[PDB]
Amino acid sequence: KAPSYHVVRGDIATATEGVIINAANSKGQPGGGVCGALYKKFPESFDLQPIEVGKARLVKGAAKHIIHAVGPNFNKVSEVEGDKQLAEAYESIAKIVNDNNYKSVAIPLLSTGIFSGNKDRLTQSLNHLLTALDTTDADVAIYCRDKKWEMTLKEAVARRE
Numbered sequence: 001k002a003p004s005y006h007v008v009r010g011d012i013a014t015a016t017e018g019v020i021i022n023a024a025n026s027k028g029q030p031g032g033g034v035c036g037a038l039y040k041k042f043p044e045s046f047d048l049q050p051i052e053v054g055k056a057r058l059v060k061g062a063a064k065h066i067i068h069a070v071g072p073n074f075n076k077v078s079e080v081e082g083d084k085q086l087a088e089a090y091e092s093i094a095k096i097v098n099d100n101n102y103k104s105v106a107i108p109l110l111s112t113g114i115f116s117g118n119k120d121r122l123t124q125s126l127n128h129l130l131t132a133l134d135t136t137d138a139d140v141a142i143y144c145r146d147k148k149w150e151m152t153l154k155e156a157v158a159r160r161e
């Protein structure tokens, strides 16, 4: 049961993976960031229902199954309680990957944009991603958007191995 990771610099709303993770809000409504991009292309895969922080929910559409996952908002929560919720959030994703036997999945770095509190959280968010998704079988496309985050991302993924 071993997962794979690769990095992709681009708009996650254009991922070829059948299953895309959304960085969602508690309210389940769009959405700047990746959420706004996914709602722009795949409104079907949104239910617009609340989601508990640190939880996730699978919404299925004709084109894409989106796992809407709620990372902490570091504007609102402490660093410690945020690290819990971020782990929590990713773990919830892995749960859904494992329950549905999803084999290939595209995931953004939760809590690194709108919910970052204006701090670089690449490493932090990546670690929690790799830790939960390591419990999956999935080929994971980690999605970023800055060329520098790409290099840093690629380099960390590679270390592991």
Ligand SMILES: Nc1ncnc2c1ncn2[C@@H]1O[C@H](COP(=O)(O)OP(=O)(O)OC[C@H]2O[C@@H](O)[C@H](O)[C@@H]2O)[C@@H](O)[C@H]1O
Pocket: 010, 011, 012, 013, 023, 024, 025, 026, 029, 030, 031, 032, 033, 034, 035, 036, 037, 071, 108, 109, 110, 111, 112, 113, 114, 115, 116, 143, 144, 145
């Ligand atoms: N289209 C995209 N494709 C890939 N990566 C993206 C995209 N848009 C943004 N990103 C990057 O994904 C990371 C996650 O940022 P956000 O999308 O802001 O998610 P998050 O920081 O968890 O904040 C979630 C909050 O934003 C709202 O849109 C959403 O409804 C929730 O309230 C950031 O590094 C950001 O630069």
